[model samples]
Target: FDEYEYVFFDIFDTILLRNVYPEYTKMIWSKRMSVQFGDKLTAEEVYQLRSEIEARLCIENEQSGKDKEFHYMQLIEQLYRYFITKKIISDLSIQSFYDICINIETDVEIGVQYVDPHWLELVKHIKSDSRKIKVFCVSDFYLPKATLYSLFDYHGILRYVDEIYVSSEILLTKKSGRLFDFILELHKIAPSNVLMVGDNEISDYKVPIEKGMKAYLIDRTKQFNKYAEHERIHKINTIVGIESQLIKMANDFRKITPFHNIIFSLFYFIKKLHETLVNRGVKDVFFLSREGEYLKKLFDIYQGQEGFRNIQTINTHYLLVSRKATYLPSLKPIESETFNILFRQYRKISAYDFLSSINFTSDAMNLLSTELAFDLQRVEDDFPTSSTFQKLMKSDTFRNIYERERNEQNRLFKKYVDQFNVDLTNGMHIVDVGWKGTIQDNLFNIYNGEVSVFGYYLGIVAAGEMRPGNDKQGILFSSIPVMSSYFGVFNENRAIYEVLLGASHGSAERYNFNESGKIIVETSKNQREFEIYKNIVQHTQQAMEQSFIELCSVLCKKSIDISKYLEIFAKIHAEFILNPNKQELQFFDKL
Candidate 1:
């Protein structure tokens, strides 16, 4: 059925497409060029410089009446010399990396060649046809024939191509019709015997037809139309705060593992934490102990990347001890509702374990069960209903002693705040993932309404409106004149929430002062084990940081939707929480 003996294909658009973002190419190379040249310049500026050099080179050749075509490698070497004199990049060896950058830049940032799977089948079908038509690659490009073959090979299409001819090798181009004439002569075939297929209207269709060779134009108008619509939607989504582009690009760019999904949750939380702190205009952020330990570490790394100058992380644990101690005792008057919240909200705990956190003091342990009317022998069992616990809490000794411990907790919290010397009037923020405004409320009451304490939490399920005078904002949720709100989905998964917010180190139990006024932090037991836990956290943070760095470097700050990420966290969290590994649970079981 075929009249033609040879079918020639165009390279850049017909067989292979450069699937890269137009703007991102310079950004990727500029960073590497900066390091290689030891110079400081913006990506756009470097790109403009390269363009100017290539244009001037071609112009000089034209003015000199040279008949030779420009070679891409030669142009790159010339660019190297110009960059050298311009102090952009120092060595020619550095020039070699330009191709490597283009390779990765196309893969990770700017995609290259949309050689769809269908195209492969079409090529193979044509090659095996009974007509036995030969397939050859032809393009008007500055790249050498070897580079063109490599390009085709990289796309997995070289095996189907019989030969490749590029202008860089022939020093003649199709624009003047010499390239077609040369091919026709070399193969000893009439122009009518060759069928050329390509996308460019003039080069592939008109020129081939003008030469009496049959030709077909592949309509790539759909590709351009799709990109235009995509770009417009990107702008629209970006303006409306939907984050539809860069974040999607990043979503694809990262090679994710199940653990990396957890890491994304961590990174996402820390990013929101960072945004909260930066917006509040707080000078120093004291990540509450336990969860705040790793949070503060991640915040520091993010701060460096964003080049934020004013904010800093203080290794402070005051809010950590303040919340557990004050709130649990005050759950005293043991309202039926409050006790239910504790029972319903908490995960994997014995009644004694919870009371121990608030009961404090070595003497309280012995007296707690007897005074509260709960049997110590039954300490391992689930806690009592509101009625029994309420009757016990309403007792005179329990209230008095509970008040004593509660008061002591306030004293310790007050001293802990005093040690930091934080400004009272300037206002300060406490960063934590939260349910209720316990810490914020406790600190507000303990400080006698002197300091304006702002709470930044991943979430806050406020009981009623927040405590008067103290303000709290949730990263995952917003109060907006309501009691509380949630930021991420699956608020019911307490185990995953806590595990995600869990501190690598032991919890800071309480703070006390020695005779010399030096603060003594009574941390949770198991330091050697905690040392390992801390390493796990640090290693995880490092891996997460690297994954995101690669993602962010290639694409701009795209708003990640993070809902899919929540699904990942839900699965990962349930794995540990529903039936935790024997040891991982022990890390927090002790706390």
Candidate 2:
């Protein structure tokens, strides 16, 4: 709408595209996958046999006791490397392999019909004989020239503009500074006279905002209300809100640098995370475009979101701070406490087990089972098993540690395997396979509540770092699910355990059965398919019984802390080296 030298129109949604549809990936997953809330694994027909109880009772939890990203990366890596060579005709000398893992032959048949989008509607309203109006569209895909020709030719809008700078054409797109610089120079116009529009902030906003031009933000996410509240802001919205903005800016356009600095800092953190992970022990690594779960949580609490809101003292949103402010009427919290200093955070660490009842939602989150997840501690010579919060309880495993529940963990795990159909024979043979990422009655480590609470029982979680790196780049060894909840978070890493958690109830039963291929298909209407469900319940109970029994056995004996041994271990860590010691000498001396 600007009467300036040129008026650009963004495409791939500025003109035509559907606004809404169910996620194709999700829909595909539901229809094709048969892992209906089962926590077991079953190979083709006969499962990779295991020895937990018997073939049928051998339990196959989907929990692969390894890391999540590692597993995912492994999957992607192999898929990427693999090539399905095919020739249209055997006589042809050439053969090709297209991507199979992620490629989807999109059934984009708009069976429902459509219309030209909003921007195209606005283009018709502009006045005739306007100043030298020009149109340029930008996109990320590095498309071939033939495709570009067809795109503009089919649209037939190229007649209206003097030049076009499809990023795919200029070989410039989002992310790099050069892309923006190329766009600015390629068009060859005064910064003031130029106008740009796009559906992205970084690809669309950052470049224009940086080159001292007003930016148009397409509210694709329907997150406009919050965007408006955002401070040090610029012009944003879908409908080419550029003209009114430029007229308003006239001589007073002063793009703020503070916001720019924050974006740069985020990029820096991303780079640092990559470097750290690479230096550590990450294999088959590549730069991540989006922040992982860990850093994404950090973003919500970062200065950009938190500081922009200026939500210091406390509001209802910040329960802890709001409660504190309410408690003491006189004392006021500071605008920003010392960099490292933080307000104390309080949470619930229940003394008794949080029993799962009928009402609890059995989704990915808030999906948990207490009976199967037992906490263990070493006490003395005889070690058996134990559960959480029983003081000085004895163990029967080897009569060691404050408590021990390894046996029970194994028991329920065995049960879950049979129920789910996963192969225990393929599962890792550690003392016990623990799931990770679920919440327990303990003080979580990160300031951000990302560290998955349901870890160690099921879901993505961290345990030991096989190597060194910051949060992102370093490869972390995580626990795999032995039983319960859902198909154990698929292993990106070739995890130690293959004990799949199978599938859990989209119902209150909250048990997962394996359906990777061995079991019959089940839908919401089918309840008969759940006949094998008792295997999960019965085995889980047995696991609980074993846990309690082990606890009783341990409590009947004594335990030794041997603080000196701990001190030696601490010494080893302080020097950043492993310190092997002869504990046999100490035992001999005592004897």
Candidate 3:
């Protein structure tokens, strides 16, 4: 809540540091097990490392073991010192992490990125709005020192950040009552002119608002009308509007006379007028509608300089468009009147358009979570019969085929897998090879021992569109990420439908050997043995088996004919039979 002199920054949430680095923690801390020694290291060995490292450290040299817990703290300080220097784990493959994190507000992707990878544009915006305004970084812990240095030191995001608060270092967790008192503490330490911009309301907004500090909610979902103007909330949805929000909070919103700054500040006013009109004006609002169009032009100026897609997940799926893939859990079919309430009654769109009875939700906007449990029947009964996919999987050794895929995947990348890697005797180094799709996998040949193991599953899906809008189907593996859970059910169904109707585009394109597709295992100075371990089938099989098991559990939630569902899933999602397909799958009106 403290903003004037020190904007305490929370690291994990507010700062938006994309967790990309591959953490070499076990090498540094001897602290956490999952990190060091792969969680397999003996407890005695882990403790020995901790004890030895702790003994050498001098965090509380002046405290002189005042807190017998000094032994515990010594370990922590040693770890921080170690991790600050050595930690380097990231999911992103490209280099130049500093550039990616620094200019995040401006929206540029320095390396191969996944989501909201930029963080510099907003910082640039804030610095422009108020010279005195400060930013703070509050995080849990173990954010690499390099990242912090890049943020605070090199990139200068930290300079604007007057104060930093990391949970691990503060010894006060977000869950603690002391954390709630953070604003009060800040007020005691500095001026309490505070406002927070966070993706979450509970942690960021509620806490600061309770302490008389203002809060602005960022639109993470891109759907803010549902709850943006909630009586309990003050929200800002656009990066274009941020400066205006700060100006409103400033001492002089109506009077700023600098000529160059005035033109720059006009966007902030349009943003303000835009917010006012969007929230409460009817046909009478002109400034917002007329002036708001500047945002697009604004982006046009900085268009190619950044890597941002205006991905708007609309409420309605086209009539002919397959609903199988567009079925986002968040979109609920709103009642006609409910839509009117949100679109027409609450805030009329245009006096020219009467816009009543729209399909968009009339209800308040929010994180409407959905969890549709699947009903998993026993293996035999659960497996579908009617679908072409079922017929394919049911053919002679479809199970063996699945098993073979699993075995081969393990043999390729088992050595470096997060789990179950070393068990394989035939495995060599793990390789992601940065394949955007299965097509890239073709160059990665198995005979040469370089196999590209797609994360999350042994199999993958296709997602590129060939003919502009020809159903624009893509593989689940390619379209969505592995850690995907929100839209996964729909994506899985999409994959099955693609496979069922003989629809895999270039499905049979096998991996071919190439000089570029080589198995490489990198070793850190910490490990004594540098041999590339053989791949084991256990990890792949375990993941698949466990996934299927969990999927079965999910299936039990709903009561439906599993077989029929599979068929419906297979025909529309997969769209083709794999055995005979060399080209993309063709959609069939009927099985």
Candidate 4:
């Protein structure tokens, strides 16, 4: 147990694992940096500039007979100078810019690095052993000793680490075998008295052995296979550069908050939607109101990404339509078949709810209630047993008012949709956070086969068979002919998705024309819902967008089949929705 007095460890891929590719971390830094510069430089340009400047600095160091190592501070200084030279940024904000760039890079580095539990346990054991073994972290990274120490401290391993050696600080790397020699000379230790453990073969194993030190190569690939084989298969299929990094990222994200889970699930759905629309040759998409409000924003962000830029462009429009607004317009014969949407959802209907669904004015509702001998304040349980309600349904006065209001709603709804100049004859693709898709059915019935409605839903709860001219597919789960297990689980917790993806605005209750002759939307009021949106949902949406941007930076110009990651995404989505953590449970409880 005490064979060696000194134990050296590789900081990266050994003591700690990076949740993203090394270069991917730099791209994140560049993205943040570009945003600080008011985005005058695109993230891609900033990344390229940083790489070029670092490479030039390294080459200059090599030509001057140095070790070809460059410090992070020096690299950022040169980047700042390059920006100044190109007039992309001014010297007036040099201090702020430099501090921001350094902090961003450091934060990005810290965010991606997590202590490897196996190494952490081993280091702890070594330090607590009877023998006093010295633990040192050796790495050939651009971050200097101070930053590396900060990373170690952040991960709670700095206490176990006796010292840290970084290439950028010493101008000597383990790859050249000089760092080991320097260490041995400085510490006056024999080669056999030092044991080095690291993942790199050349720098950690061969070079250390060549310098007469004991070395053991850690097989990170072998360690990664400790998880389930299916997970490994999915990781290999989806991640292009480092197979385990994205899996770790997903796991870490899933633990952060429920919002992170929603972000990944929604992004996956949007990506799948983009691909499906492109394949179906559908050019125009209508995001149905409320849920579509947020979906449209995410779709726009996904559309502008580099991966989708080369593909066919699908135009997205947010349609101001809801079940409340479309129900009356969809009614043709007012029979039991036509009223299934209302009956299936509510066994007992309140006078207010039923009247509001039909867009009846308060005065007219009271008058009708008196004529039918019904109490406007009371709720009817069994319509078959209630003769007054039956008479009210069959009354000529009720029929006349129903027909008039239905015709008016249809006209206003048509005028509202007409503002978008959508071609009804062409296939109309609509998106929504799904349930029975009553809104889509309403739209289909409104045009009466003039437009072929294709609905894309996050998940669909089937009420019955889809109409002949209408088509829909669930991106995550669906129950068209029969309820699948996945769809059943999703259907139970469907309201949570609505709340998470719901728009900041209220639900569209009715449409009317203003004095300017422009279509105006009248929405239902929910002050509590609006406050929730403003305080929580909007911030989550912003973070979700930032996550997408960071993902695009990692996935830049790389075409990977997004379908392969569906299993992983669904697991994350289902796990959160089905059995959320305590924090998520508390959040949902409030909702």
- Please report the candidate that would top lDDT against the real structure: 4
Candidates 1 and 3 compared: the better one by TM-score is 1
Which sequence of candidate numbers ranks them by lDDT, best first?
A: 4, 1, 3, 2
lDDT of 2 by residue, 81-149 (tens): 321132112222212111211221121212111334466555554424443355555554433444444
TM-score, each model? 0.46, 0.25, 0.25, 0.58
Q: What's the true lDDT of residue 162 in model 1? A: 91
Index of the highest-TM-score prediction: 4
- The lowest-lDDT stretch of 10 consecutive residues in candidate 2 is 312-321
Compared with the true structure, what per-residue lDDT tens digits does model 3 show for residues 1-591?
A: 233544444454345433222121221122122122223443235446555664443334325532212233344445444434554323422233323322331222112122233446666566666566666655444333344554455344555555555543444434332453664575464324655556666656666666555666565553233223321221111123333433332223112211111222222222222222222211121101111222223322222222222210001110110111111111122211122222322342221121111111211011110111211111232222323223433344333333443344334332222232232222211111111222222212222323322211112344322121111111122343333222343443233222121211111111122466543332122221111111221222223223223323322211121222322332322222222133222322211
> Relative to the unseen true structure, what is the Cα RMSD of model 3?
27.6
lDDT of each: 0.57, 0.29, 0.30, 0.73
* Worst 10-residue lDDT window, candidate 3: 312-321
Query: How many residue-pair clashes does candidate 3 contain?
Result: 69
lDDT at 380 for candidate 4?
77
Best-to-worst ranking by TM-score: 4, 1, 2, 3
Candidate 3's C-alpha runs over 4 A off are 1-10, 17-119, 140-160, 180-191, 222-591
Candidate 4 weakest lDDT stretch, 10 residues: 228-237
lDDT for model 4, please: 0.73
Cα error, candidate 2, residue 554 (Å): 59
| Residue lDDT tens for model 4, 1-591 | 448889999888888776555556676666555545655776667878888888887888768766777888788788778888888776557676666676767766665567888886798899995978899878988887988887788778899989898888877778777778788898898998889999999999999888878899989885454333424322311443333555555666665446576676676677767667765657789998888888898888776663232224567898887777888877875554246667766757767677777677787788888788777777778643466557768887778788888888888888887888778676888998867787888888887677788989988767443777788788867776665445554466667787677588888888788999888999887999899889988877776778777665555332245655555655656666667767877777676
